[PDB]
Ligand binder design. Structure first.
Ligand code: FMN
Ligand code: FMN
Lengths: 139, 145
């Protein structure tokens, strides 16, 4: 039992999330391949204002932020050092629909980028937690 | 087309992991994995099983960089330039060797050396893949201190 969870330092089971992605009915977006450098956030929609409960190394690398600086915050801070992508994401998330947009975001140093953002709200799990996954990519 | 914007290497590592997760007759329970996991992918149909991909977690765990380790066999991790040669060879090495050869899952613990010479008890798990559209067999390794 000393090896329980040694392959997730966060104790988050991202692979559980991957399984949900693959199992979703009526998938509308194909992610294509993901590797371990992927920018990825998990937000708990079951908590008020969809706070970040996990971000991959790839997200920190993309944005220049660190864990204490972003954990527990809504992803919208990325939009500031407004776009119709914002409302497209708001509405999709509300309907629990998959959505993909391009939108201008900003790294910690204030540098703007065009971020290709995919959000899969997925679903509330029997515990009631509701992990939404977002993937980011600088184009 | 947005295909491949979420894998700069082109490789579907996470599709690889998912297949693994749901494999029949598992022998080891991997447990939870996150995106920091140290991971190597080796093409064992190519001479001396070269690394064709290592995760950010692998470079963070071991201290090497991509161009230092790509194309190389993973055994360099058993070597510190600042240790004396071994007669004391771990059973871990043979177990890995024999498992790889039989396309068998295997999990051992063994001493490796970060690039700065520090030993760590690496818990290495090696899993087999099926022949890719290539006809090539791969092995996925998961490392962790
Ligand atoms: C899992 C997840 C990841 C998200 N990632 C991003 C992102 O990378 N960039 C961004 O601008 N918005 C992202 N968002 C969108 C914002 O968090 C927010 O939902 C958006 O601004 C619409 O809501 P609002 O009108 O209240 O601000 C993400 C949302 C979720 C649920
Ligand atoms: C995917 C993969 C990952 C491996 N990862 C490690 C590792 O992290 N540490 C280690 O000491 N050996 C690792 N090995 C083992 C060596 O690469 C090699 O197979 C082992 O030393 C046995 O072969 P040998 O007797 O020729 O040295 C890995 C092998 C494979 C195929």
């Amino acid at each position: 039992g000393a090896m329980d969870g040694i392959y997730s330092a966060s104790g988050i089971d991202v692979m559980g999330i991957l399984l949900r992605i693959a199992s979703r009915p009526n998938p509308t977006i194909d992610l294509g391949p993901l590797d371990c450098s992927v920018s990825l956030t998990l937000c708990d929609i079951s908590l008020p204002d969809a706070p970040i409960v996990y971000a991959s190394p790839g997200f920190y690398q993309l944005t220049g932020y660190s864990a204490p600086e972003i954990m527990g915050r809504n992803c919208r801070f990325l939009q500031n050092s407004v776009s119709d992508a914002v409302q497209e994401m708001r509405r999709a998330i509300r309907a629990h629909q998959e959505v993909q947009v391009r939108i201008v975001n900003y790294k910690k140093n204030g540098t703007p980028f065009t971020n290709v953002v995919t959000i899969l709200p997925l679903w509330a799990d029997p515990s009631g937690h509701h992990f939404a996954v977002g993937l980011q990519a600088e184009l």
